[PDB]
Amino acid sequence: GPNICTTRGVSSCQQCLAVSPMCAWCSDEALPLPRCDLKENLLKDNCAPESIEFPVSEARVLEDRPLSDKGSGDSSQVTQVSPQRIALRLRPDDSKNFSIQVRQVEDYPVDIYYLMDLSYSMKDDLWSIQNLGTKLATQMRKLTSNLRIGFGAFVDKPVSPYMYISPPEALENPCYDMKTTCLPMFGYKHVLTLTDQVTRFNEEVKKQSVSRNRDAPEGGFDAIMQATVCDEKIGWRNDASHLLVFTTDAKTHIALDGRLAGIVQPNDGQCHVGSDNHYSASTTMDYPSLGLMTEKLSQKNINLIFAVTENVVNLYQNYSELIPGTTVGVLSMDSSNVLQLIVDAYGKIRSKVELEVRDLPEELSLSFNATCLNNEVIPGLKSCMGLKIGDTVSFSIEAKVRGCPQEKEKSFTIKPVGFKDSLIVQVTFDCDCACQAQAEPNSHRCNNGNGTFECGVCRCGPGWLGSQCECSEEDYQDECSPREGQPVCSQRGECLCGQCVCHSSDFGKITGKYCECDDFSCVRYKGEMCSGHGQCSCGDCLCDSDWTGYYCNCTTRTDTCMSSNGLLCSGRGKCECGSCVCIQPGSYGDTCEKCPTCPDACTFKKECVECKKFDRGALHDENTCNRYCRDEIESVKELKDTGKDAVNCTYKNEDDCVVRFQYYEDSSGKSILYVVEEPECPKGPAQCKKKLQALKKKNAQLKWKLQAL
Amino acid sequence: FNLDVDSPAEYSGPEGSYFGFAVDFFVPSASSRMFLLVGAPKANTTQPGIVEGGQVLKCDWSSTRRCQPIEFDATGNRDYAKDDPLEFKSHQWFGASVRSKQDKILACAPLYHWRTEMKQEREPVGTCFLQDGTKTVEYAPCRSQDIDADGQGFCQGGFSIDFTKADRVLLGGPGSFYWQGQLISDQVAEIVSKYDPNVYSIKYNNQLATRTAQAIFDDSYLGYSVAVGDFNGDGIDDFVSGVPRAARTLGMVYIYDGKNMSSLYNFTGEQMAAYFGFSVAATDINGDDYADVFIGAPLFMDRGSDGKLQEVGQVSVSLQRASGDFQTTKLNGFEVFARFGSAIAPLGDLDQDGFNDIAIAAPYGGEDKKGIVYIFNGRSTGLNAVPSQILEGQWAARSMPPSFGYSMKGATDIDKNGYPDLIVGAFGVDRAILYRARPVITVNAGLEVYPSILNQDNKTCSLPGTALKVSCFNVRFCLKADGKGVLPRKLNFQVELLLDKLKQKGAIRRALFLYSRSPSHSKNMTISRGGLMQCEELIAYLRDESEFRDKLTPITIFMEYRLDYRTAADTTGLQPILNQFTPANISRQAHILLDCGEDNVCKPKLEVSVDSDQKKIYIDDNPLTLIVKAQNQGEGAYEAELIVSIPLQADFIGVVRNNEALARLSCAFKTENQTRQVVCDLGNPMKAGTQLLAGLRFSVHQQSEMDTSVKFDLQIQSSNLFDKVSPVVSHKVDLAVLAAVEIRGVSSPDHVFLPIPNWEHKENPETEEDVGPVVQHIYELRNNGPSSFSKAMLHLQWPYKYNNNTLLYILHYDIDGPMNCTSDMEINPLRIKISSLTEKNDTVAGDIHTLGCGVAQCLKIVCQVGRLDRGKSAILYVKSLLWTETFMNKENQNHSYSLKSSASFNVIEFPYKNLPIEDITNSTLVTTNVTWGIQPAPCEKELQALEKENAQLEWELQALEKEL
Ligand SMILES: *[C@@H]1O[C@H](CO)[C@@H](O[C@@H]2O[C@H](CO)[C@@H](O[C@@H]3O[C@H](CO[C@H]4O[C@H](CO)[C@@H](O)[C@H](O[C@H]5O[C@H](CO)[C@@H](O)[C@H](O)[C@@H]5O[C@H]5O[C@H](CO)[C@@H](O)[C@H](O)[C@@H]5O)[C@@H]4O)[C@@H](O)[C@H](O[C@H]4O[C@H](CO)[C@@H](O)[C@H](O[C@H]5O[C@H](CO)[C@@H](O)[C@H](O)[C@@H]5O)[C@@H]4O)[C@@H]3O)[C@H](O)[C@H]2NC(C)=O)[C@H](O)[C@H]1NC(C)=O
Ligand SMILES: *[C@@H]1O[C@H](CO)[C@@H](O[C@@H]2O[C@H](CO)[C@@H](O[C@@H]3O[C@H](CO[C@H]4O[C@H](CO)[C@@H](O)[C@H](O[C@H]5O[C@H](CO)[C@@H](O)[C@H](O)[C@@H]5O)[C@@H]4O)[C@@H](O)[C@H](O[C@H]4O[C@H](CO)[C@@H](O)[C@H](O)[C@@H]4O)[C@@H]3O)[C@H](O)[C@H]2NC(C)=O)[C@H](O)[C@H]1NC(C)=O
Ligand SMILES: *[C@@H]1O[C@H](CO)[C@@H](O[C@@H]2O[C@H](CO)[C@@H](O[C@@H]3O[C@H](CO)[C@@H](O)[C@H](O[C@H]4O[C@H](CO)[C@@H](O)[C@H](O)[C@@H]4O)[C@@H]3O)[C@H](O)[C@H]2NC(C)=O)[C@H](O)[C@H]1NC(C)=O
Ligand SMILES: *[C@@H]1O[C@H](CO)[C@@H](O[C@@H]2O[C@H](CO)[C@@H](O[C@@H]3O[C@H](CO[C@H]4O[C@H](CO)[C@@H](O)[C@H](O)[C@@H]4O)[C@@H](O)[C@H](O)[C@@H]3O)[C@H](O)[C@H]2NC(C)=O)[C@H](O)[C@H]1NC(C)=O
Ligand SMILES: *[C@@H]1O[C@H](CO)[C@@H](O[C@@H]2O[C@H](CO)[C@@H](O[C@@H]3O[C@H](CO[C@H]4O[C@H](CO)[C@@H](O)[C@H](O)[C@@H]4O)[C@@H](O)[C@H](O)[C@@H]3O)[C@H](O)[C@H]2NC(C)=O)[C@H](O)[C@H]1NC(C)=O
Ligand SMILES: *[C@@H]1O[C@H](CO)[C@@H](O[C@@H]2O[C@H](CO)[C@@H](O)[C@H](O)[C@H]2NC(C)=O)[C@H](O)[C@H]1NC(C)=O
Ligand SMILES: *[C@@H]1O[C@H](CO)[C@@H](O)[C@H](O)[C@H]1NC(C)=O
Ligand SMILES: [Ca+2]
Ligand SMILES: [Ca+2]
Ligand SMILES: [Ca+2]
Ligand SMILES: [Ca+2]
Ligand SMILES: [Ca+2]
Ligand SMILES: [Ca+2]
Ligand SMILES: [Cl-]
Ligand SMILES: [Cl-]
Ligand SMILES: [Cl-]
Ligand SMILES: [Cl-]
Ligand SMILES: [Cl-]
Ligand SMILES: [Cl-]
Ligand SMILES: [Cl-]
Ligand code: NI
């Protein structure tokens, strides 16, 4: 039928291609009366096949390496992501779908650099980790056969007011007044480089000592930044798990806190540690901004862990939520449980895979459909939760470009947070026809050089309203209307030399073959056209990056639909246009987190027990039991009073047996299910005449007494 | 937008001295010589044995640009004893904060140290130096006999300072009291009159100060920034101070009374570490005379379109409502790491539009990360979101970033031009810049053409110079100008008019003036401010019919006007600028009538009609479609356009291009003056006998609390002389009340099993364990519908007892919502103590005989519900205990029951009085099944069979009895 390519793209080739990805242009020969039309339609018009300017959006895989089963092999390159390279070609306002797979391989080498607060309050903590290295090393044999470790230390910017300036014996020994003694003060110092030898570690722990400092908040961020950005001194290995552990019993200083000390220079994210193994810019440069820390951690692919005492757990909980790829754990005052915190934290990190994007053009946007287990598909989502080792995950991506940018080539990276391997997408844009380079300025083909000839058409200059730049106010007709029973150029113009001349309103630009398009016809959401998130073309709102819908008032975002628990709409709703659409009855709220009248917790977790422990139930049938029930669950001899918070639950299983268990919410922030191991089940194994008759009498009466209704 | 970036004045200082870290104007008043004040904290001074003592320079603005350091203290470090320095002025950062009012000037050294005057120590108490006219004294309130961290030893007073209209000083210091921070205020009079050089720790009769708080407030940094403004009745300026690390480093801003230093209001940041309260400022932007608050959060991170977090910084604008309830909005930065919101500078009324303006800086923004400052104009609604101007840094980073805009001060007319100016500074490059405001000229233009429609055969006026008569007409253009400040009253303008502008070179121009014989008129017109507009008119005509064949295209009359900026100068040559939003040009259009035949006079005869949808609009934003039929009965109509006046409740969502039958029309939204309009093109011209039918959509949300209907006024308009408009149709749409109110219920637990584990009967029950398990029935009344109801009632039927048996024993009942309830029976008569759980997690994700309150003794709880709006509810949590012995006694042994609790509601009133309120009611029940377990299967067989039948038959009869 009368497609738009005919009406909106008749002006020229470049314009034609911009009208729509489905539009084609005939750049050769001459057939008066649509140079811009569908590919097939142009074939019916006998346009030379090789003269058809019809680009095609495509995404070729430049490098496709197979994933690895194990990462301990030194005989081959480790691949955690596939494919690695993709060449992406795109048309103006077009889109293409491609995919990417990620896997956490087994026996993957690890880098662990220890960083401890050496404030006097942490004096004891140092003595407790003297044997930590090896004690943990043995515990890490099971997780991997390849591991390197090192050590670093920090106190705070060695300057007033944080440091004792007087007396002179204070700066040398801040514990001069204190019992015994203590080291001077320093921002940060490197001790041991990441090495495969665990022995040299414990030797350095003894070698290092403790220092005191006024004002409890410390300068850990300086140490974090430097340890991250400094690759050589720390010795981070490629194709290895980068783990940075941060231990402190007190608060932390933040950016702009330096102005009190007279520091006005922002952190540059550059390594200033020298051969002296100390932070040089400690005193000169201000604390790093969280955005900067996030950036560098992301770049260097470092997983940051917060080992913090109960009192500050909450403070670092909120902080961690601002920096992806980071966990929070409770470090005991004696720093004894640190070893456990390590193994557990590692599990949390490898239980989740998150994707990040680098160097993405402003004109380019992306969409996602996350596939975690089996047929599970989660639109808009770019990460997955609750995973294990050797587990593979997939993501269906769709790239949509707004317009056709100037630059020829761009390269943006899509990678898992913390992982070295990645997918580099090389994107190009076809904004022009090949015949444009063959254009002929003021060629004799158009009214003796009064017009330019390109792509098999004469684009005439001002003054000539006819093709070939012939007629100017002469006697001619053609078709200025779609049909003889319709007006002329929509009364936005008239027929001159057999063509429509669009007017120009103060509102916008009237364009199109029959002057049917403009910039102001588009719909308006609330006070703005296309919600301001789109630009109007012939009454059509073209949504900008990360915007969709007819009115472009629907975002592609998802994070606003995430709940505190880390679930989409609390699993009781689906995210639509950024806001959760609650499904579960009696549930509502931003993330559908509020559900007063929905069944009690016991009713929800009875399915989890029935699946995890009994390998059955409606939950088990859908194979969602593993991701749903994240609660640690164990079989107990008897149900005990763990807390006023704990709730004793009871239910009858499919075997008609009474099952008892309880749910605990708290105790440092982890949920556990305790199920009684022995559910109660069914037990396997004259005068009587007067008794039967006695009941028979009653039955006769009772039956006869059935009446009324 | 009126600031002159053409040729601003630039001032410099010693490299590495941080020249331009702090800035302010110096106005001794009495209409006297002007100066700029620049602080250089790292400037090496002449003070003996003192390095980078810091200094504040007085830059001469007039003519030569030369900064002459003002020396407050020439001496070195005083001595506590022989070879025992009392103080340490090296690197004391003097000039880190500078403020000036009238002939008074105050500069501080936040890094000035102290010996404590007791033991040998170095404590940064900070000091300041006040200079008023002929007198110069040192002011250091934190320097006292209260020392160390716990005291003001580490105060660092003077970190931020400011004056009040009452000539009182507001000085803050973060370090006081383990870095809780502190605000100290003193009367300038006392500061100087109580000053004794021989006394290091001075006491002031009248001083306001914040006291030490709990240790939990340590490291809060109160006094990081300061600003002044009155937020209560009295004319006294009240204290405002940023507290960036307050609330687990979430950031806060404390406001204290200017009189008794009593806390008035508080603010808190949304994001941690964003440093909410880094900088604070106060000005009345909406001209309500109520000081409006501004808080900077340079490290704030908004979420990009992708949903990714990005540090753009943020500034919260809080308008002070007379009532006291601040209406606040947020403003995100425009670039990453630019740290937008580092400096907020009041500009006063910059464009003299009647609304104070303001400037916000992103010192590290802009390409090359030099620096950028955004300017924002205020108005009735408030501060205009988008900035009207942008300033760029002209210097790069040697090592330290230029930090252009890090410190700035505006709101002062130095050149006496009538407009305030702005001082911006970059300590990174040791430079400072002054921006003079240009005079703003508002202008009104007009263009008239009559008669618009033209009969080619008219031939009225005669073409001069010949015997030819041509069809002519009149053209009338007007220019009115006005402005404020210093400028020549007479303003010349270069005005150019072109006829048939649409036809450019290469194409014939169809119209030209009667005399010049050309479509070009060049006029030098000079007009004065006020209503002395001139407005000249000329006569133009149309060429003969036989000179062209195109009578269709409309002849566009174009006018352009531009003033001579050179002759509009004021003092040193400062060129003015037109109002930010003014049409650079305006144009009208004429037309040629034809085919009118005999009468040669076209009568449009336009009609318009709107079909009533019949669909009532319910009170959220409801979709509404309107059918429209516009027909042209008579001859052609030029510039035909459908004009519609919509009320305040209506927002135009767009035109309907979905339906084929409905002709797709182009329409736009236009708001002129206080009028609210929708314009749709009906074709230019709309030919004779043309009938169109289309539709328009709207999203409507009630404005007035009570309204019968919403009226719309529609009509068609044309540029014709006769019958140029159609009748006005008033179509009202009645508003309806729709409130889908449902009531939900649940039982927690929903199923109880017997017997009760380790339970024992008590002749005299005491605890919950003595009675039985906890059974909670929970009902929720929620209003989903768009409309809201003001009042409602809710009734509850509880299974109180059965044959004098307790059944469910209500211990207590809680409520969350407007609802208030009463029980007809005393709750928890036995006075059993409450133990088990209001908080947290709902985010986790014998046959059967029902005992209804109808068949069992009933306890009733009636409740009065308040107002419930869209998506709002009221909840009733009924906590009870299952009375075990009841189910262990009498007929209860092997039987299973379902305890039924019914609850119904009814809406009694609505907030909409002028509308036909419709009552609504529904009901719901909550069942708790009590069941026995482990008794399904293993003379005596037949015996047991009839025993179960018997028992069951007993209950069914007992039911029918009590049911009647
Ligand atoms: C804007 O934001 C601002 C910041 O958030 C808000 O400002 C806040 O305003 C509130 C409300 O007034 C303040 O709370 C008050 O805190 C007072 C603390 O006073 C300190 O200093 C005195 C000595 O001068 C001590 O006596 C205090 O007691 C300490 O020690 C005792 C035990 O001996 C302990 O109970 C205290 O908690 C406190 O201990 C802490 O501090 C010490 C160090 O001093 C630490 O070592 C220790 O570890 C603790 O950290 C304290 O040190 C307090 O006096 C005020 O008391 C009122 O309220 C309490 C409530 O229980 C009440 O008991 C008290 O007495 C009442 O009962 C008495 C009989 O028992 C009666 O005699 C009396 O008449 C009363 O009826 C008072 O009612 C008060 O709690 C915050 O301090 C303040 N924060 C800051 C930083 O300014 C502001 O409100 C907000 N504005 C707006 C508009 O929202
Ligand atoms: C109300 O009640 C609901 C339901 O109980 C609460 O929802 C819970 O929210 C918490 C977060 O507050 C969720 O914790 C997450 O845990 C996963 C870990 O992945 C899962 O699978 C792992 C496989 O290795 C396994 O190790 C984990 O086991 C841990 O957690 C369970 C409890 O579920 C505990 O019993 C174990 O001992 C372990 O401690 C777990 O099963 C984690 O990926 C989540 O993000 C973490 O990691 C990311 C990325 O590094 C990091 O950014 C985060 O900061 C975090 O460290 C998150 O920690 C938990 O899954 C939810 N529980 C359930 C069963 O749904 C909800 O919190 C309560 N609301 C309120 C406000 O009180
Ligand atoms: C054929 O063409 C001739 C020549 O143009 C034309 O004569 C014109 O008639 C018009 C309309 O009567 C005259 O315009 C008038 O001018 C006076 C001042 O001289 C105005 O006051 C009149 O109206 C006032 O109010 C109007 C309200 O809309 C305003 O538009 C206007 O500005 C005034 O405020 C009125 O407009 C005009 O004077 C002559 N032109 C000349 C040069 O003679 C004649 O009408 C045409 N004949 C036909 C049959 O159309
Ligand atoms: C979930 O169910 C669990 C199992 O029933 C509950 O465990 C119970 O926890 C409570 C405390 O919260 C205990 O209550 C105490 O009971 C003892 C009884 O012992 C006394 O009498 C015995 C003889 O019967 C004698 O041997 C002892 O010496 C004592 O003289 C009381 O003495 C206490 O004061 C207190 O009331 C229960 O004992 C305990 N029961 C069991 C079987 O473990 C748990 O409370 C439930 N969880 C929640 C929070 O709902
Ligand atoms: C105020 O006056 C003070 C008077 O002492 C100035 O003190 C000087 O400041 C510098 C640092 O800016 C001190 O640091 C020295 O730095 C050099 C390193 O510089 C190297 O390169 C330079 C050439 O660029 C070369 O000249 C040097 O030899 C080095 O090769 C060190 O080598 C020095 O040992 C020393 O650490 C100077 O010590 C100090 N100079 C004096 C006279 O002692 C201060 O800079 C002034 N501040 C301002 C803002 O004006
Ligand atoms: C981040 O800090 C906030 C407080 O600023 C914590 O919020 C508290 O969380 C506890 C439970 O851990 C609740 O009992 C309190 O009611 C909360 N207080 C407030 C004011 O919200 C929070 O726990 C910390 N991190 C997170 C988000 O868990
Ligand atoms: C009008 O007068 C100005 C001086 O006021 C002169 O500079 C200009 O050339 C004149 N414009 C024309 C082109 O008539
Ligand atoms: Ca510290
Ligand atoms: Ca006041
Ligand atoms: Ca105000
Ligand atoms: Ca203004
Ligand atoms: Ca000025
Ligand atoms: Ca007529
Ligand atoms: Cl708009
Ligand atoms: Cl779309
Ligand atoms: Cl849609
Ligand atoms: Cl001032
Ligand atoms: Cl908000
Ligand atoms: Cl947002
Ligand atoms: Cl109410
Ligand atoms: Ni003294």
Coordinates of N, CA and C in Angstrom, one line a residue, chain B residues 319-390:
Chain B
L319 N 11.2 26.6 49.3 CA 10.4 27.9 49.4 C 9.8 27.9 50.8
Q320 N 9.9 29.1 51.4 CA 9.3 29.3 52.7 C 7.8 29.7 52.6
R321 N 6.9 28.8 52.9 CA 5.5 29.1 52.9 C 5.1 29.8 54.2
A322 N 4.3 30.9 54.2 CA 3.9 31.6 55.4 C 3.5 30.6 56.5
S323 N 2.6 29.7 56.1 CA 2.1 28.6 57.0 C 3.3 28.0 57.8
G324 N 4.4 27.9 57.1 CA 5.6 27.3 57.7 C 6.0 26.0 57.1
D325 N 5.2 25.5 56.2 CA 5.4 24.2 55.5 C 6.2 24.5 54.2
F326 N 7.5 24.2 54.2 CA 8.4 24.4 53.1 C 8.0 23.5 51.9
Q327 N 7.7 24.1 50.8 CA 7.6 23.4 49.5 C 8.9 23.3 48.8
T328 N 9.5 22.1 48.7 CA 10.9 22.0 48.3 C 11.0 21.2 47.0
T329 N 11.9 21.6 46.1 CA 12.2 20.9 44.9 C 13.7 20.6 44.8
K330 N 14.1 19.7 44.0 CA 15.5 19.3 43.8 C 16.0 19.7 42.5
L331 N 17.4 19.9 42.4 CA 18.0 20.3 41.1 C 19.3 19.5 40.9
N332 N 19.3 18.6 40.0 CA 20.5 17.8 39.7 C 21.5 18.6 38.8
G333 N 22.8 18.2 38.9 CA 23.8 18.8 38.0 C 23.7 18.3 36.6
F334 N 24.6 18.8 35.7 CA 24.5 18.5 34.3 C 25.7 17.8 33.8
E335 N 26.7 17.5 34.7 CA 27.9 16.8 34.3 C 28.5 16.0 35.4
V336 N 29.3 15.0 35.1 CA 29.8 14.0 36.1 C 31.1 14.6 36.7
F337 N 31.2 14.5 38.0 CA 32.4 14.9 38.8 C 32.6 16.4 38.7
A338 N 31.6 17.1 38.1 CA 31.7 18.6 38.0 C 31.4 19.2 39.4
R339 N 30.9 18.3 40.3 CA 30.5 18.8 41.6 C 29.6 20.0 41.6
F340 N 28.6 19.9 40.8 CA 27.6 21.0 40.8 C 26.9 21.2 42.1
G341 N 26.9 22.4 42.6 CA 26.3 22.8 43.9 C 27.4 23.1 44.9
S342 N 28.6 23.3 44.5 CA 29.7 23.6 45.4 C 29.6 25.1 45.9
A343 N 29.0 25.9 45.1 CA 28.8 27.3 45.5 C 27.5 27.9 45.0
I344 N 26.7 28.5 46.0 CA 25.4 29.0 45.7 C 25.4 30.5 46.0
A345 N 25.3 31.4 45.0 CA 25.5 32.8 45.2 C 24.2 33.6 44.8
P346 N 23.6 34.2 45.8 CA 22.5 35.2 45.6 C 22.9 36.3 44.7
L347 N 22.1 36.5 43.6 CA 22.4 37.6 42.7 C 21.5 38.8 42.9
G348 N 20.6 38.7 43.9 CA 19.5 39.6 44.0 C 18.7 39.6 42.7
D349 N 18.1 40.7 42.4 CA 17.3 40.8 41.1 C 18.3 41.2 40.0
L350 N 18.8 40.2 39.3 CA 19.7 40.5 38.2 C 19.1 41.2 37.0
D351 N 18.0 40.7 36.5 CA 17.4 41.2 35.3 C 16.3 42.3 35.7
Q352 N 16.2 42.6 37.0 CA 15.3 43.6 37.5 C 13.9 43.2 37.1
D353 N 13.6 42.0 37.0 CA 12.2 41.5 36.6 C 11.3 41.5 37.8
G354 N 11.8 41.8 39.0 CA 11.0 41.8 40.2 C 11.2 40.5 41.0
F355 N 12.1 39.7 40.6 CA 12.3 38.4 41.3 C 13.8 38.1 41.5
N356 N 14.3 38.0 42.7 CA 15.7 37.7 43.0 C 16.1 36.4 42.3
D357 N 17.3 36.5 41.7 CA 17.9 35.4 41.0 C 19.0 34.8 41.8
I358 N 19.7 33.8 41.2 CA 20.8 33.1 41.9 C 21.7 32.4 40.9
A359 N 22.9 32.0 41.4 CA 23.9 31.3 40.6 C 24.5 30.1 41.3
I360 N 24.6 29.0 40.6 CA 25.2 27.8 41.1 C 26.4 27.3 40.3
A361 N 27.4 26.8 41.0 CA 28.7 26.6 40.3 C 29.1 25.1 40.4
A362 N 29.7 24.6 39.3 CA 30.3 23.3 39.2 C 31.7 23.5 38.8
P363 N 32.6 23.7 39.8 CA 34.0 24.1 39.7 C 34.8 23.2 38.8
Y364 N 34.4 21.9 38.7 CA 35.2 21.0 37.9 C 34.4 20.6 36.6
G365 N 33.4 21.3 36.3 CA 32.6 21.0 35.1 C 33.2 21.6 33.9
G366 N 32.6 21.2 32.7 CA 33.0 21.8 31.4 C 34.2 21.0 30.9
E367 N 34.3 21.0 29.5 CA 35.4 20.3 28.9 C 36.7 20.8 29.4
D368 N 37.7 19.9 29.5 CA 39.0 20.3 30.1 C 38.8 20.4 31.7
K369 N 37.6 20.3 32.2 CA 37.4 20.3 33.6 C 37.9 21.6 34.2
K370 N 37.7 22.8 33.5 CA 38.1 24.0 34.1 C 37.1 24.5 35.1
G371 N 35.9 24.8 34.7 CA 34.9 25.2 35.6 C 33.7 25.9 34.9
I372 N 32.5 25.8 35.5 CA 31.3 26.3 35.0 C 30.4 26.9 36.1
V373 N 29.7 28.0 35.8 CA 28.7 28.5 36.7 C 27.4 28.8 36.0
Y374 N 26.3 28.2 36.5 CA 25.0 28.3 36.0 C 24.2 29.4 36.7
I375 N 23.5 30.2 35.9 CA 22.6 31.3 36.4 C 21.1 30.9 36.3
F376 N 20.4 31.1 37.3 CA 19.0 30.8 37.4 C 18.1 32.0 37.8
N377 N 17.1 32.3 37.0 CA 16.2 33.4 37.3 C 15.0 33.0 38.1
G378 N 14.6 33.8 39.1 CA 13.4 33.5 39.9 C 12.1 34.1 39.3
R379 N 11.0 33.6 39.7 CA 9.7 34.2 39.2 C 8.6 33.8 40.2
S380 N 7.4 34.1 39.8 CA 6.2 33.8 40.6 C 6.2 32.4 41.1
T381 N 6.2 31.5 40.1 CA 6.2 30.0 40.5 C 7.3 29.6 41.3
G382 N 8.5 30.3 41.1 CA 9.7 30.0 41.9 C 10.9 30.2 41.1
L383 N 12.0 29.4 41.3 CA 13.2 29.5 40.5 C 13.0 28.6 39.3
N384 N 13.3 29.3 38.1 CA 13.2 28.6 36.8 C 14.2 27.5 36.8
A385 N 13.7 26.3 36.4 CA 14.5 25.1 36.4 C 15.8 25.3 35.6
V386 N 15.6 25.4 34.3 CA 16.8 25.6 33.4 C 17.5 26.9 33.6
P387 N 18.8 26.9 33.5 CA 19.6 28.1 33.7 C 19.5 29.0 32.4
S388 N 19.5 30.3 32.7 CA 19.4 31.3 31.6 C 20.7 31.7 31.0
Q389 N 21.8 31.3 31.7 CA 23.1 31.7 31.2 C 24.2 30.7 31.8
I390 N 25.4 30.7 31.1 CA 26.4 29.8 31.5 C 27.8 30.5 31.4

